[PDB]
Amino acid sequence: GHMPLLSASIVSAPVVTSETYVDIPGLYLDVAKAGIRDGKLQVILNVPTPYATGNNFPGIYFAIATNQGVVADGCFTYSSKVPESTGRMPFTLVATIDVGSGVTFVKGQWKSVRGSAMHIDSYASLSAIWGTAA
Amino acid sequence: GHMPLLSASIVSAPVVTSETYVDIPGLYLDVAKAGIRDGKLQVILNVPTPYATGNNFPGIYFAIATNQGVVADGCFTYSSKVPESTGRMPFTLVATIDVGSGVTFVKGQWKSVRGSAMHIDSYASLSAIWGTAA
Amino acid sequence: GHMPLLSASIVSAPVVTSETYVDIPGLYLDVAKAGIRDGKLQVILNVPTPYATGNNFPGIYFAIATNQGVVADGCFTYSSKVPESTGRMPFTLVATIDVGSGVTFVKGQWKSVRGSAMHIDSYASLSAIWGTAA
Ligand SMILES: C[C@@H]1O[C@H](NC(=O)c2ccc(-c3cccc(N)c3)o2)[C@@H](O)[C@H](O)[C@@H]1O
Ligand SMILES: C[C@@H]1O[C@H](NC(=O)c2ccc(-c3cccc(N)c3)o2)[C@@H](O)[C@H](O)[C@@H]1O
Ligand SMILES: C[C@@H]1O[C@H](NC(=O)c2ccc(-c3cccc(N)c3)o2)[C@@H](O)[C@H](O)[C@@H]1O
């Protein structure tokens, strides 16, 4: 049937700040295009090597979003006001969505903690597994 | 057949300490209620934004448990005795269990590192995918 | 059919350094032995409790590799030159591979950041879910 495994990956994104959730370019799954219109998707946003730069306990919020908006989110933050070096802080987020609710796409998004610039310069992925009771 | 994707999520838990693994309230999957009695479950415990508070290199242990007890565990810990700010330390744990062994539920659990108080104040999830050779 | 859930887990590995990706002993899935020769695998490398020791902002790179080499990688790093204590830095990596390309096994691998010694002394896992459009 429909291939039940969906995936998108990137190796970089332009460095930005944001006060709201904004798409991480390339982390996008087109569910409607796949003909998936019911059942559930287990979605994993994997950003294994991010870093944040800023002047006030930097960090990044990440979200899984659909056309209906944010379904789940989280963040990492450093434990010092201005880290001596902004270390790489692995981040994974997992959510399960009902496609029947009207889901046509899934995206990874990010937002600044305290004005931080947001850095991806290596592999990151957005994955989904489709399940049905049919 | 049985919907092969199971999930539970929370956005907070009462702040506690524990010297043993104790349930994270709400992170519970009822496998027996779903009629799943054989095959395997790939379980993901996702706690993307925890923090620990304490006086001695704080942290949190997390576990995946069934009615048979802990199947897998791990922790995060800070790298300073008393962090200047207790940053958010994303945590994910993945284990695969044989349901045929007698599994009726799956839970997320947590335990203090060195007496730490344990904090969830945003999204966290427990997910499972059922697979069968049938 | 073929059990669509594959998993391997360990609780320790000999402490090593490496300037290249080297196998994490025991984190190995034999895909060919399972008779899986097409479709896709969603692979998760879960190293929830590693630490790195070294003198120069320590860390560990991790990779998912097949017989064809590295498909995805990432790292954690500390935010201090010589951490007061090398805290536990949870790490997860997720990649989806096309088995049809000629994949016969999947492995977790690791490599030093800046000469770090690499430590696993508790649970770690390598998991895969097989999906087919057939
Ligand atoms: C901001 C600093 O960034 C440094 N890493 C790199 O400059 C870099 C460039 C490419 C990569 C990288 C990562 C993960 C997988 C792969 N293959 C490559 O890392 C860190 O070592 C410091 O600790 C610190 O966080
Ligand atoms: C203990 C401190 O906690 C602060 N965060 C919050 O007080 C907070 C309240 C709600 C949330 C939060 C998280 C993740 C997703 C969402 N949507 C919301 O965070 C951090 O900024 C500091 O770095 C530090 O760890
Ligand atoms: C290097 C130091 O390592 C300490 N942990 C241990 O020595 C240890 C030995 C077994 C385990 C361990 C872990 C995860 C799950 C389980 N069950 C057991 O941890 C940390 O507390 C410090 O913060 C610090 O990182």
Angstrom CA distances, A115 to A59, A76, A81, B22, B88, stand at 9, 14, 13, 37, 16
Q: If you ran DSSP here, which 8-state letter would residue C100 be given?
A: G
Nearest Cα neighbor of C123 from C12, C4, C3 is C12
3-state DSSP assignment of residue A32: coil
- Å between C73 CA and nearest CA of chain A: 6
Q: Whose CA is nearest to atom 9 of ligand 2?
A: B121
Residue type at position A81: K
Chains that contact C by 3+ CB pairs under 8 Å?
A, B
Which residues 66-105 on chain A approach chain C with CB closer than 8 angstroms? 78-80, 83-90, 92
d(CA A114, CA C3): 46
d(CA A125, CA A62): 12
Q: Decide: A44 and A124 in contact? Cβ < 8 Å.
A: no
Residue A95: Cβ-neighbour burial (10 angstroms; 0-12, 13-18, 19+) = buried
d(CA A120, CA A26): 12
Secondary-structure breakdown of chain C: helix, strand, coil percentages, each rounded to the nearest 5 = 0, 55, 45
Angstrom CA distances, B95 to A45, B57, C16, stand at 18, 27, 25
3-state DSSP assignment of residue C134: coil
Residue C100: Cβ-neighbour burial (10 angstroms; 0-12, 13-18, 19+) = exposed
Ligand 1 pocket member A129 (CB < 6 A): no
Residue C100 backbone dihedrals phi, psi, to 5 degrees = -55, -30
| H or E stretch at A5 | strand A5-10
d(CA A115, CA A118): 9
Letter string b/e over residues A33-61, b meaning 16 or more CB atoms within 10 A of that residue's CB? eeebeebbbbbbbbbbbbbbebeebbbbb
Rg (CA), chain B: 16
Could C74 and A88 be called an inter-chain contact, meaning their C-beta atoms sit closer than 8 Å?
Answer: yes
The method recorded for this entry reads: X-ray
Measure B88 CA to ligand 2 centroid, in angstroms. 7
Entry resolution (Å):
1.3
